DNA sequence: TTCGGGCTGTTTATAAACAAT
DNA sequence: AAATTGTTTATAAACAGCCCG
């Protein structure tokens, strides 16, 4: 029960996966993760870096802009449908 | 040398298909920094080929841009 | 022929500079 | 400014496929 055996990609995926509109704000990602996995309630300085790194880097995650600017300071993220259901397994162990 | 690995791999291919060890060589042949040692930065060269869509493996296979 | 180690690749994790908003 | 959010390179490592001695 030290670290959840998920990648950041896994985590971001199930985060987007778990939105009702299937779009989520970066801080919404941070939250979903900490809300559920106690490991990431500390230190959070660093692993939040690597979450942002995985959005920027990975073609599977699609930044779409905010709506009505409420409040703003960050676009929404989604999944390239080519990669929605990439973690077909369901337990997010492989992609 | 103030070049990235991507820079280095690029000018390697630039110099137009090359084998991974051919990359290693072009780099060491020219930049003494990457002569000693050479156990880690070769890792990151391979990492940059796998990772970056700009590099195209055609059939160690050859690499291109 | 099996074993167990070296290269190819590929994928992740972490840390950092650095720009955009 | 002043922080968050994004983009981009690094550096190391976990983990396959091999070809090979």
Cis peptide bond prior to B47, omega within 30° of 0: no
Say yes or no: Cβ of A7 under 7 A from any atom of strand C.
yes
The answer to whether the beta carbons of residues B16 and B64 sit under 8 Å apart is yes
- Token pair, residue B8, equals 């280095």
A68 touches A76 (CB < 8 A): no
DSSP B29: H
Specify the number of domains making up chain A.
1
Euclidean distance between CA atoms B39 and B24, whole angstroms: 11
Cβ contact A84 with chain C strand, < 7 A? no
Tell which residue, A45, A35, A41, has the closest CA to residue A14.
A35
* CATH code, A1: 1.10.10.10
How far, in Å, CA of A9 to CA of A24, rounded?
A: 14
Which protein residue has its CA closest to C1' of C13? A50
- CATH match of B1-65 with 1.10.10.10: yes
Which nucleotide is at minimal CA–C1' distance from A43?
C14
Question: What stretch of H or E contains A60?
Answer: none
Provide the experimental method for this PDB entry.
Answer: X-ray
Helices (H), A1-95: 8-18, 26-36, 45-57
Distances (CA, A) of A72 to A27, A56, A69, B48: 11, 18, 5, 35
| Domain extent at residue A63 | 1-95
């Amino acid at each position: 029960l030290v670290k959840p055996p998920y990648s950041y990609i896994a985590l971001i995926t199930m985060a987007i996966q778990n939105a009702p509109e299937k779009k989520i704000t970066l801080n919404g990602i941070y939250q979903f993760i900490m809300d559920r996995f106690p490991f990431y309630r500390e230190n959070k300085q660093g692993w939040q870096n690597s979450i942002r790194h995985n959005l920027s880097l990975n073609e599977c995650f699609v930044k779409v802009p905010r709506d009505d600017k409420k409040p703003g300071k960050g676009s929404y993220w989604t999944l390239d449908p080519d990669s929605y259901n990439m973690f077909e397994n369901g337990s997010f162990l492989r992609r | 040398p103030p070049y990235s690995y991507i820079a280095l791999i690029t000018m390697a291919i630039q110099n137009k298909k090359i084998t991974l060890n051919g990359i290693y060589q072009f780099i060491m042949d020219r930049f003494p920094f990457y002569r000693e040692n050479k156990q880690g930065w070769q890792n990151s060269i391979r990492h940059n080929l796998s990772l970056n869509e700009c590099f195209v493996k055609v059939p160690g296979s050859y690499w291109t841009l």
